[PDB]
Design a protein around this ligand. Structure first.
Ligand SMILES: CNc1nc(Cl)nc2c1ncn2Cc1ccccc1NS(C)(=O)=O
Length: 164
């Protein structure tokens, strides 16, 4: 059902994550990690201490879709395994250094056409699909967005709930 998901989302914070390519989102789904640019890395570290759950909602640039959502399980960390991200032009590995661990809540896609009725107060009430990497999504809009995704019956939210 949707009851455990609603519990995880209670009083959560939500952030839009934008990726230039599918390869990096596939790697994030396989390994449970994400890296972002230093400005957003600072914002996410602050949010992680401030909320029971910090939810990252992923969208690959030019895909017209969200590719799923995940909960931060840690602040960013350095020096571990260099993740083999595909880097866009003008992007170095030292800029994507700093690895967050994430627990996927939904690995299913949602087309932007399905979220056209949701606007984000923190981005001038533009449709929630609009935003830069790291754009915060207000609680009510983020909750409704996450509830639009198809259920991912391959995920048991029991272990996620314990980490709260
Ligand atoms: C593994 N982490 C990432 N991997 C990829 Cl391939 N792209 C990312 C990632 N993190 C943020 N981006 C988007 C981006 C790339 C370059 C310059 C600015 C921006 N941010 S923007 C204009 O809002 O889209």
């Amino acid at each position: 059902g949707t009851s455990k998901l609603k519990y995880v989302l209670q009083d959560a914070r939500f952030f839009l994550i934008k990726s230039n390519n599918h390869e990096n989102v596939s790697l994030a789904k396989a390994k449970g990690v994400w890296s972002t640019l230093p400005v957003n890395e600072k914002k996410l570290n602050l949010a992680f201490r401030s909320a029971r759950s910090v939810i990252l909602i992923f969208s690959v640039r030019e895909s017209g879709k969200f590719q799923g959502f995940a909960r931060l399980s840690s602040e960013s960390h350095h020096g571990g395994s260099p993740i083999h991200w595909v880097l866009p032009a003008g992007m170095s590995a030292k800029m994507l250094g700093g690895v967050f661990k994430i627990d996927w809540i939904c690995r299913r896609e949602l087309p932007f056409t399905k979220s056209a009725h949701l606007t984000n107060p923190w981005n001038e009430h533009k449709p929630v699909k609009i935003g830069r990497d790291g754009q915060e999504i207000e609680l009510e809009c983020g909750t409704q967005l996450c509830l639009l995704f198809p259920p991912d019956e391959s995920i048991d939210l029991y272990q996620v709930i314990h980490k709260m």
